[PDB]
Amino acid sequence: SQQEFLERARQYLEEARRDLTTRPYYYYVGSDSDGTTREARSREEYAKPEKRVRSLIEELKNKENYEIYETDYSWTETENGETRTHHIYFAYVKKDGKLEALLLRIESSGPLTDEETIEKTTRLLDEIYEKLESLS
Structure with a gap:
């Protein structure tokens, strides 16, 4: 049922918002049809490498x-030597009403400053949370 993955990603989205x-923060969480959930609340926890997920997607x-x-949604700004990057990726595959793979990547190199980008990222995180509640 991947309920564990569901709660972990809910908590990660809450903390991200x-x-x-x-x-800054870095959250990774990925589960397959076997139920093997792998998390990464730190950067170097998943900086060491999702392959089967994207392969099945493309196929x-x-x-x-x-x-x-x-x-x-990914946006980077490298100015004055500072390379502030932000990245959010979500994806679920469901074959014949059966969840085959779920994947969530949230990454923020530092606090946001653009009100417009803040609103967009909050809205996207809320959408991912609302979809994740539906995937239960």
Whole structure:
């Protein structure tokens, strides 16, 4: 059922929305149809490498009853020597009403400053949370 993964990613999204304007962070969480969930609350925990997930995605894009969803918002700004990067990737694959793979990557090199980007990232994290509640 991957309920563990569900709760872990819910908590990660909560903390991301909470610390959007507070502190850098890095959250990874990935589960497959076998249920093997791997997390990474620190950067170097997953900086050492999702392959089968994207391979199955691309294969299923081009047999049936599949519901696939993926979102990826990434923006970087390298100015004055500072390379502030931010990245959010979410994706779930569901073959024949059976969750085959779920993946979440949230990454923030530091606190956000653009009000527009803050609102966009909050809205996207909330959308991912609302979808994750539906995937239970």
